Every structure is written in structure tokens, then in C-alpha cells.
Amino acid sequence: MNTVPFTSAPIEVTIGIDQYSFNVKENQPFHGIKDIPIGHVHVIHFQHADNSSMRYGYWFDCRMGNFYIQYDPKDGLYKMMEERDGAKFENIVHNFKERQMMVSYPKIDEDDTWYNLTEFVQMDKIRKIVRKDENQFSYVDSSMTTVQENELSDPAHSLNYTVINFKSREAIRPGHEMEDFLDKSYYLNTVMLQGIFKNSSNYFGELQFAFLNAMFFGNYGSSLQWHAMIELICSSATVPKHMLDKLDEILYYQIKTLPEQYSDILLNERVWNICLYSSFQKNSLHNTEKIMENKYPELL
């Protein structure tokens, strides 16, 4: 069970750790989060009490290093850092645990939610979407634009999601215009799966990471990417059965976790109505169709 200690909490802040959240008061004796489950990526995220602008946070994997949070009063945020001295880090954590100055990652034993949301998400794939090679962890915030948004303005601070564009030469073989536009199977199976992603696991990891950034930061470009990757599968007549079944599981847990009160800003009416009721795969997503109809019948 790994630990992310905090030097201190000088400013009042709502701290998220994965799907959990805790409020910390200005100068509260808070020194971090313990008992973080090994085997998954994690996200530690922040929303300042005095300025709900910029949600921001860090994706990390405790298997890759010893990470801690320290507030920077110059740049006015909580920064993740790596501690390369193992014995110093162990001694800091031990003192903070002995003084019970840490919150415990509140995982219920029966509860697979986080695994279900991150099944395909790898830290190495996150570090290619979010490019800052000198750190082992990845900073994301509410305002970061995607490479696709930027095409349509600081490229170093971009989210490098794979560009999906249904009315592009990449999506449409000369000579197969109607075929490829009405049936996206070429674009999904040859261009995206065989060509760019190499396999369905990498495709689903990016889909899952987009959703998480949309939900935890309200990152609009990430929400666009999540819906585009759903629509690309649902708009394909030819999809491997294992991928359809896995997609239904993926989307069910994402719709299950979404805060009921963010459905208006996180769900695209057109894409969901097309995917569940019109598309080639309208009858392939039974679990997702059932939860959507029971939780968000207004959207549909």
C-alpha cells in the first residue's frame, strides 16, 4: 500500500484521490494519503476553496517512484514532486503515519469501481498523451486543450489524444466515400486499431483516460475525445465481439460513476441517442442502455 505525503496544506482545498474527495481547511495539519492500492494508476486532484477555477491534478503510479505534494506559493498550486532518497521518504511517511496526519484511501473490499474505470489505462500511455518527459507523473487541468482543438495554442501544454475526424482523408478511402462514411469499420479496424493503437487495449485505455479527465477536471476536449471514440465503434458495422462486450462494461461503469448533477455538461445527447438507438451497435450495449435509461431518461 503506497503513500503520497504532503509537506503541508497552506490553502483551503478540496482534494480528490480517484473517485474520492475530502475538504482540507487552510493550515489544517494534513500530511497526505496512505493505503493507496498498488496495481492501478491513480489521480490526485485539487479544486481551491477560494477559486474553483482551474481544477488540476496529477496522474501517477506508486510503482514508478516515491511521490509527494508540496504547495508552491509563487505559482499558487499544489505540485507533485518525486523524492529520489528512499530512506528519507520512508522516514517522513513513518512520522506522518505515527502522528495519524494522513487520510486512508477509502476502498471498500467488494468495490471494483476504480479497476473497472482504469482497466486499460497505463502510465506509459498517459505520458505520451501528456508530454513532460522529466517527470514520471502527468499534470492535467480543466483548461488544457487537445491537439485537435488547437488545429481548429501552446503545443507543450496540449493533450495529445489521437485525432478522430469522420470527414477527413484519414477516415475515407478515395473510391469508398459512401461506404466509409456510412460504415466506419475501415477507419476503426485498419486505420485506428491495426495502424495507430496496435490493439483494442490501447484504444480502450485512451477512451478511459479521456472520460476520467472529462469527469475529474471538466476538461471539455477530453469529453469530445471520449464521445468520438465511442461513436467510432458504434458507427462501425464490423467490430470484434470481444470489443463490443468490453465496451458495454467500460461504458456501464463510466455512466454508473458520473455525478447525476454533471449529466447535462458531461453527456452529448446526439452521440448517446445515435449510439444506443440508431447505430450498427444499437443492440450490442445492453448493460449501458439499461443504466442510461434508468439514470438519465431525460437525455434520451
Binding site: K167, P174, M178
Partner: protein, 237 residues
């Protein structure tokens, strides 16, 4: 964006542009079968591609053989239209290629955009104008070439005859839309107006009769009278 009444003079500027009307591409008659079911029979159709500045009409005849063994014909007709407009553009020398293609029906936007991906600088626009280009097949010489076709064919026309010798593009397009609106509204009455005086003929190389400037004013008045008469008959006004 959309071509409307606000940006109407743009049609007659020096930027090459084409209207594309797909109404008459897929044409059927509906009939009872022996068993008392209903079937369609396709007839030859056409794409109406017009330069409103010059009057040049690229009439691509759509022969019934292109539907043989195909499904979802009303959908396919839009993609076949877009394929044939794309092929026409690629056939033209660069300096004759349009900078804009205006589709008369919004359902043509995606098909045409996808066929024209190789031309990112050609704008594909809809229009808020209600244009009467469906009535092209009321022009006897156009109907005749379409019906006689035994294979796919392109036929080139100047839909303004020699009018641009005497009037502006703006005026010629206004005359054309008035004549096509009257033919759409009451074809029999519009044709009687055009052919009523036997001494005014259609030249072998023309579509419309050889009216003097004063006769065109009379004819245009008679066409507006027909359109208004038919509106009063329709609405009991």
C-alpha cells in the same frame, strides 16, 4: 455560410461558383403489381449543375442502369450526385474549377463534402433560397435528351441562350427563376404563355423562344400573373 437574400449579388461576382440540384437524379413511377403490392419503376434522371454568372449548365444524365441491383436508392442518389460533381470538377482545368458549390438541398452537404476532400479550398454551401431547378425537366429540349439517353452522358447547355448579350447575369438569373417557378407551378399554362404567338420560335441552338426586349417584359408579366393566379387558387385568396 448559407447563401440567402442578404448575399444574393455574390452569385454574379467573378468567383466561379456552381449550383447543384439533385431533385431529378432518382425519378420513379409508382404502380400496383399483379398481386396488388406496389412497385417503383425508375426513369432516366439528371444532375443540374449551373454556373449562375455565365449560364453554363452541365447536365449529367443519370441512366436507369446505375440503379440496377442497388439498395436504398434515395440515399445512393445523393452519393452518386456527389461522385459526379467531384468528377466534373476534376475534369475542368484548374482556372475553370469553382471556388464554391452551392447545393439546393441540405442533404447533399455531407455527400459532397466527403467526395471533395481533395479540394479543401472549394467551399460547399447550402442556401436559404427556394430555387425552382426541379422544373428543369419542363424545358422540352432538356427533358428530351434525358429521356432518349441509352447510357450515362454529359450534355452542355447555356440555360440563358444569348440573353447575356442584352442583360446582366443578375437579370438573366431572375428571368430563369421566374420561368422555372411558373413551369413548376402550372406547367401547361406556362408553356402556353411561351409558345402562344407562333411567329416567335426557338432557335435550333436555344432552349427558350427568341423574344424581343419588349416581348420579354410581356412574358415576364404573364408569368408573374400565372404564379399569383395559382397562389389564389391554392389558398382560396
Amino acid at each position: 455560410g448559407a447563401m440567402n437574400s442578404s448575399n444574393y449579388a455574390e452569385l454574379f461576382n467573378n468567383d466561379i461558383k456552381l449550383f447543384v440540384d439533385d431533385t431529378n437524379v432518382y425519378r420513379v413511377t409508382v404502380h400496383k403489381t399483379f398481386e396488388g403490392n406496389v412497385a417503383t419503376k425508375a426513369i432516366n434522371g439528371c444532375i443540374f449543375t449551373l454556373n449562375p454568372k455565365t449560364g453554363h449548365l452541365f447536365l449529367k444524365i443519370i441512366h436507369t442502369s446505375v440503379w440496377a441491383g442497388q439498395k436504398r436508392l434515395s440515399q445512393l442518389a445523393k452519393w452518386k450526385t456527389a461522385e459526379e460533381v467531384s468528377a466534373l470538377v476534376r475534369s475542368l482545368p484548374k482556372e475553370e474549377q469553382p471556388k464554391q458549390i452551392i447545393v439546393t438541398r441540405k442533404a447533399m452537404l455531407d455527400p459532397l463534402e466527403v467526395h471533395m476532400l481533395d479540394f479543401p479550398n472549394i467551399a460547399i454551401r447550402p442556401t436559404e433560397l427556394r430555387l425552382p431547378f426541379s422544373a428543369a425537366m419542363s424545358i422540352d429540349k432538356l427533358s428530351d435528351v434525358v429521356m432518349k439517353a441509352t447510357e450515362p452522358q454529359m450534355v452542355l447547355f447555356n440555360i440563358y441562350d444569348d440573353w447575356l448579350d442584352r442583360i446582366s447575369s443578375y437579370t438573366a438569373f431572375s428571368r430563369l427563376t421566374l420561368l422555372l417557378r411558373a413551369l413548376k407551378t402550372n406547367e401547361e399554362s406556362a408553356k402556353m404563355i411561351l409558345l402562344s404567338d407562333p411567329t416567335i420560335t426557338i432557335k435550333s441552338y436555344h432552349l427558350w423562344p427568341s423574344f424581343t426586349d419588349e416581348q420579354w417584359i410581356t412574358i415576364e408579366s404573364q408569368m408573374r400573373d400565372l404564379i399569383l393566379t395559382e397562389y389564389g387558387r391554392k389558398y382560396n385568396v
